[PDB]
Write an enzyme that holds these catalytic residues in place. Structure first.
Site, mmCIF file in Angstrom:
data_model
loop_
_atom_site.group_PDB
_atom_site.id
_atom_site.type_symbol
_atom_site.label_atom_id
_atom_site.label_comp_id
_atom_site.label_asym_id
_atom_site.label_seq_id
_atom_site.Cartn_x
_atom_site.Cartn_y
_atom_site.Cartn_z
ATOM 1 N N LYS A 184 0.756 -1.053 0.044
ATOM 2 C CA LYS A 184 0.043 -0.005 -0.021
ATOM 3 C C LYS A 184 0.796 1.172 0.197
ATOM 4 O O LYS A 184 1.846 1.394 0.686
ATOM 5 C CB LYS A 184 -0.790 -0.204 1.208
ATOM 6 C CG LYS A 184 -1.613 -1.484 1.305
ATOM 7 C CD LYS A 184 -2.824 -1.272 0.155
ATOM 8 C CE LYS A 184 -3.793 -2.219 0.498
ATOM 9 N NZ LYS A 184 -4.308 -2.829 -0.685
ATOM 10 N N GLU B 227 -1.758 0.554 -8.826
ATOM 11 C CA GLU B 227 -3.411 0.294 -8.503
ATOM 12 C C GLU B 227 -4.073 1.372 -8.153
ATOM 13 O O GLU B 227 -3.743 2.126 -6.941
ATOM 14 C CB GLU B 227 -3.443 -0.971 -7.701
ATOM 15 C CG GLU B 227 -4.575 -1.459 -7.750
ATOM 16 C CD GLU B 227 -4.976 -2.712 -6.963
ATOM 17 O OE1 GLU B 227 -4.366 -3.791 -7.467
ATOM 18 O OE2 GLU B 227 -5.821 -2.912 -6.054
ATOM 19 N N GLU C 168 -12.047 -2.063 -8.874
ATOM 20 C CA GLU C 168 -12.569 -2.921 -7.799
ATOM 21 C C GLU C 168 -14.064 -2.525 -7.191
ATOM 22 O O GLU C 168 -14.718 -3.425 -6.899
ATOM 23 C CB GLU C 168 -11.746 -2.908 -6.258
ATOM 24 C CG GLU C 168 -11.822 -1.615 -5.888
ATOM 25 C CD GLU C 168 -10.867 -1.530 -4.774
ATOM 26 O OE1 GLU C 168 -11.253 -1.478 -3.464
ATOM 27 O OE2 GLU C 168 -9.500 -1.572 -4.914
ATOM 28 N N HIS D 3 -10.185 -8.996 -8.046
ATOM 29 C CA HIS D 3 -9.860 -8.302 -6.803
ATOM 30 C C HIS D 3 -10.500 -9.275 -5.765
ATOM 31 O O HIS D 3 -11.742 -9.763 -5.829
ATOM 32 C CB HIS D 3 -10.579 -7.000 -6.732
ATOM 33 C CG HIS D 3 -9.722 -5.882 -6.090
ATOM 34 N ND1 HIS D 3 -9.834 -5.526 -4.771
ATOM 35 C CD2 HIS D 3 -8.864 -5.147 -6.386
ATOM 36 C CE1 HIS D 3 -8.947 -4.686 -4.417
ATOM 37 N NE2 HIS D 3 -8.378 -4.256 -5.324
#
Ligand SMILES: [Cl-]
Ligand SMILES: [Mg+2]
Ligand SMILES: [Mg+2]
Ligand SMILES: [Mg+2]
Ligand SMILES: [Mg+2]
EC number: 5.-.-.-
Lengths: 373, 374, 374, 374
Positions: free
Chosen positions: C160, C216, C242, C292
């Site tokens: 992340k 992403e 997603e 996802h």
């Protein structure tokens, strides 16, 4: 002074005497969900939202009331932004309670708090759920509209797209005959169509002089089909009732998809973002006419916002858009004592929202906790 | 309330610079401020500030704007400002400011509470320089002027380019880099000097540097498509729009994707409400907004309130609110309100109305004598 | 068959985390799971899984969805899921899975067989982290977490970014780069933190690094043209979507060249048949699709079946099917279905129905007690 | 099942026309049809149909496709059909049909059930005409032929234009108009005869007519933008795409807004699943889909199954599913399956597999002698 100390909630429910419908089907009941936020000093404010009652009610009791208790009621923008993350439907009712508390603490009306109104009267159109489950539906619809014409409404919204073209045209011809050309007619298709199906109406649009616009003829997943259809039709195209805020209108406005945007206070993130929807349209050079199928208290906020909106044209007597006025069976229109005279609403000018929530209606329609369905 | 406007006072101020300083448009020889005080029936008053050439500004107020305002309802801010906008754009912001103070005092709350409450109480600022000076040793004067501000804990600066050959601007920036180092963020302001090919010459340096915050207004805004072209070719963000009059002018720039950052100025847009709308428009578009404020003290305080009431632009716990411009060049009007940054952050006043008082000492000392500098 | 649904069982599950973890949206404090069991007249049953806030979800099943499903023909799968989707999109998804299991057991075949047969039996996965934690030492905790999963023979990871400053995030990723080295693929997940310019800051590391799989969801999705512009400036592919409800939502993105890789989630789109349509849509557009699955176990099994039934995206004999997301954070629900990768490859069960059993010990252990997390 | 293909039988069929008819590509002199029957190990069988020049079609199957297919798993439909697609487009569709029928049979269900369950069981159809005949009385014959089918209760019709002058075709279409009247939907099929200017000559008639379903394939497809331009100028919808090989070929036509209605043909696309994908893809794009079926009886039955499994395109309770093409010209292969409209509606068989049987009498009667037509 303004720490939040108590919140009361009021899920309300009414099963319809006689069902009515649009292209999405027959409606069987009306609901409504009021909240009352009360601060340390006693200053209180009301808000309204709408969503399916079992889920909405638990959302409030298990999450939102727990979170708002002890919070500073003056931190409107911040509190609403945080709730919008969990639950946008609730954020809107919260934002309205908090505004009424702000106005009262400031000793002014909501309109004054926002910077002063431009006007005292707002035009509205009568909005109908035209279908009913009767082979005589066309003649019921005609009767219904007649009734409202007698009251002096000059504009109407009616439903198309739920039965074949031949059948809906027959219905609208019947309304044209009764109403005549001095009545503005809005046709709402509730996204039933594709562009070719919506285009069939053009041969009637060409010869009719009184169509105010064509509402949501298509779904919104392809913005470019709206810009395409709009460029082919002889009447304006309106929409956007399900958009959650200015950020979703921007690409539609940039792509010239719509003549008229139609935010709903109870669909967007708060009365501050709703007011931003309206100004946004002003800045794109497009119209804004608030949507309010459900809404009574929130409809009052749409009225206050419309009163604080600058004119869209230089025409001395056609420079502000009407707001939607549901005229079907719905006892929640009386939650606030305010109704049009001759299709104009005179805005309350007293402190707060300048009127009171009608507890007889709140108590008359208390939801008993069970799901219809 | 129904309270009327009964008096408006005007304060044109003027200050001749001891040492001139400049940008690509040339040397500045003086600074100015024009303050107004609107007084209602109940004695509640409010102040606003505007900027324009003093003789025309002064007559706009005394021969039209004030005559129109007298007797109007102070609570009709939206409507009064909208009408004034049509006669004198620059005066609308000042009027809107003073009516906002009145509104917040009338409601017994701060300006930020009038707006729905602040999100934060600390706003980052960058040190903004007019780096050209009238001297062959201007590069070294620049460097120590910068040095002097870096000592006060500013972590970001704006300096000027496009006023002289590329070669010489490079020299200056290179000198500032050797002094400031990679941890100071550097904004380069071209003041519309370039075309796309000229702006692009910088890219071979933008390639290598890691502390360029943005390149500011490299081009004029006649051809929005030339911005989106340039923007697409450069390795740093492009900011601009200090002359736009409000959100309607930004909308086509942001639809065409011309800018990473918009830079509205309170005293250039149509009233403080429109100014707030520019910032929120930027958020709705997904672009950043960092207020412009070469002039301004009282209007800059309103830009600080506005920024404090703006949601974050990112989810970065440490970098989610844009800075605002802090002019650090000689200007006694920086002190009209007694509020200054500490270590490149400004702490927002929380008190009622504007939470602060205007320095009447500065007001009287810099009273304009009514004569034109030329 | 004409066979009817006669009973529906519901199993909401809750697990409070021992140590919180997070992304740019903040810290996660619990994980939950919602299963359903649909039983037909003949005793054939099928399970499904959805995700949403449990009080609301539970009431939607018990008060609307179950009352509507009782007595319906289990074989009208398209028709039923479409009805439910209008009301409750999360629930339709769980319903479609249950009905698909039933269809496969009634047909005496596996799910993949029901769909026309698999292309392959092994599906690659990447180890997916919630990299942030409540600690000054969070970087070295993430490094240690990542090291651990690399010893299991994961060859790709997702971590992340976006939740703290660019400089701190880069220290985090560089630490990862030093410990993993260049033979591990790294995916950076910004969770919509950025605007295009902030995302672009990573470009100067993208140029240098050789093992970035993709960036992403760097931006929110309100402005597709911002994706298309950003994608054209970066040296690594861009992935996202997603939160899209189904193929209809993806079409404008794909028409406008917004994305290299779409990432639908079984539990976010309208049931398993639309999910598979999201996959094929990508193939028809000439773009990749990688499911996802931050939450999901039973539904992650369906994404596996769906990937095994997907044509190859390339002619590369050993690089022609995209990986699926494999959450490696503390989650007891990962074991509802007894299925784990070896050395980053998952071997698809081949038996009837879903070819595997739900672990009832996990259902019984993590039974939700009814209360909200204050 | 792991059940293997053990035997394939083939049935080339040929019928010479008693009287010819045609369209703008000229007169038709014969009909052909080509059935296959795939038998598995367990003795479950299934039938498929394709179309092409018999001589080349026949050696294709006998020398390549059949050899490849023996010993293979009937359950690997996606995979087997994809491989065949590579060498033999047209043969793949016939194979995908058979394997689907095998699949449903082994499932003990109908094809529609296999696909997830029908939405409806009646499908509207249009009477499709080859209006030109070798005779100076062709107009009055067309009028007669059309009349005979109106009497049978068809409420929609397609006829040919573009094979003679505009003046002569308008005279034919006016006569048709005058006999059918405004309650009959008329479709005008140009078979790519025109450029945009010649198609637009019709608009002055479309202005006035109220019953035009659509203008079909007025132009060749090399220039998609010319379809977008034309579409935007006409008063009636445009349909086409009968020769597209699958979803990937429709995608740029749909992204460019070329068509109101696409018309995939089961025997032209890569198999039945790919056909279903074409219909679903039209849904996701907000466009309509109406299956083409000039040739076809068994394939037309699958096209009918697919339409029964397609969700509604509109919210109009009486007008929400597209009709499909019903050839009404002399062709004995229309009875290969015993299924015919009643008053322009087909009731879908609901039994296991394809829910009907191939008429072997027809098959035996029209066996191809192996000769090539002249
Ligand atoms: Cl999203
Ligand atoms: Mg509407
Ligand atoms: Mg500037
Ligand atoms: Mg993601
Ligand atoms: Mg055709």
């Amino acid at each position: 002074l303004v720490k939040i100390v108590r919140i009361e909630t009021f899920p309300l429910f009414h099963r319809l005497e006689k069902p009515y419908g649009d292209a999405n089907g027959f409606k069987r009941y009306r609901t409504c969900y009021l909240i009352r936020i009360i601060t340390e000093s006693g200053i209180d404010g009301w808000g309204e939202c709408v969503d399916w009652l079992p889920a909405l009610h638990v959302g409030f009791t298990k999450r939102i009331i727990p979170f708002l208790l002890g919070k500073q009621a003056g931190s409107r923008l911040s509190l609403v932004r945080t709730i919008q993350k969990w639950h946008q439907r609730a954020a809107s009712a919260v934002s309205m309670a908090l505004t009424e508390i702000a106005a009262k603490a400031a000793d002014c009306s909501v309109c004054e708090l926002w910077g002063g109104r431009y006007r005292e009267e707002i035009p509205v159109y009568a909005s109908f759920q035209s279908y009913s489950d009767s082979p005589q539906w066309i003649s019921r619809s005609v009767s219904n509209v007649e009734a409202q014409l007698k009251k002096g409404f000059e504009q109407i919204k009616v439903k198309i797209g739920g039965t074949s073209f031949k059948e809906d045209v027959r219905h609208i011809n019947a309304l044209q005959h009764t109403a005549g050309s001095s009545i503005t007619m809005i046709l709402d298709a509730n996204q039933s169509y594709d562009a070719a199906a919506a285009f069939k109406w053009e041969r009637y649009f060409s010869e009719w002089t009184n169509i105010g616009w064509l509402e949501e003829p298509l779904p919104f997943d392809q913005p470019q089909d709206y810009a395409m259809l709009r460029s082919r039709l002889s009447v304006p195209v309106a929409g956007g009732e399900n958009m959650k805020g200015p950020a979703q209108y921007v690409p539609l406005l940039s792509q010239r998809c719509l003549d008229i945007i139609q935010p709903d206070v109870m669909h967007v993130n708060g009365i501050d973002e709703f007011r931003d929807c309206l100004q946004l349209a002003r800045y794109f050079g497009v119209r804004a006419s608030a949507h309010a199928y459900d809404g009574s208290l929130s409809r009052l906020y749409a009225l206050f916002a419309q009163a604080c909106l600058p004119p869209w044209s230089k025409m001395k007597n056609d420079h502000i858009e009407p707001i939607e006025w549901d005229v079907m069976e719905n006892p929640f229109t009386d939650l606030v004592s305010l109704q049009p005279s001759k299709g104009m609403v005179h805005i309350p000018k007293g402190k707060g929202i300048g009127t009171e929530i009608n507890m007889e209606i709140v108590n008359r329609y208390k939801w008993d906790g069970s799901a219809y369905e």
